[PDB]
Amino acid sequence: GSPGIQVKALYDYDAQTGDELTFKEGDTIIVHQKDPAGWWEGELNGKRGWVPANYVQDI
């Protein structure tokens, strides 16, 4: 199957650090880990980084 859990972004987000992902509503984020504390390890367009879990569809 896919290398991870694919989820849709619900809103645009602009990264506030170099280790966060920037994305737009409708992007498909690959989730690698559902880390505790509100930020998940994800991947988009060849970059690995943190995604705010409240910005992607469901949990």
């Binding site: 930020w39 705010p52 910005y55």
Partner: peptide, 10 residues
């Protein structure tokens, strides 16, 4: 539409 606030990063 309005967005949730990102949670603390620390």
């Amino acid at each position: 539409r309005p967005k949730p606030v990102p949670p603390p990063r620390g």
